[PDB]
Nucleic acid binder design. Sequence first.
RNA 1: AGACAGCAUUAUGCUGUCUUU
RNA 2: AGACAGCAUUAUGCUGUCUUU
Lengths: 70, 70
Amino acid sequence: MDPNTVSSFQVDCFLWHVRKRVADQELGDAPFLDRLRRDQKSLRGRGSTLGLDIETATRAGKQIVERILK
Amino acid sequence: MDPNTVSSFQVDCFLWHVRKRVADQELGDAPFLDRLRRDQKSLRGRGSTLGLDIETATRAGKQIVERILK
RNA sequence: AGACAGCAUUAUGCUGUCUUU
RNA sequence: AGACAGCAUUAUGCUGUCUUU
């Protein structure tokens, strides 16, 4: 696998999860929710193409984000 | 200000900053960088429409996300 | 009715990953 | 050449915010 393809997928998965939690807390406006829906479909297609699992990639993206924010 | 319009802007600003830091660490693929550029333009337009500053909104988004992830 | 951003559907151009004799 | 996702430009439909008769 191309390293940056995988890391970008992982980060994108984690950031989608963050956005979902924001939406769950009733903080999203209608466009924010529209983007959440579009991006869920996008990540599903990307995940399938890569043979990777979004839930697993989410944990990896969390690790990456935690590293770069310290 | 519509509450969810402002919170969505703040979260989006913070998540853009996170993606920029990911890019700076050479972890982004070309599409990831393409979206970073598009979303920068989008946030500038949204910020201008709202009369808000992206840098200040980034800090608010950080607080929101930290609260959400606790 | 205007400004801004997005989403959906279409077109055209392009980028990336992977497969491909 | 195929699959997937995106970006750019353009068309149409729509959503939200704000402004405005």
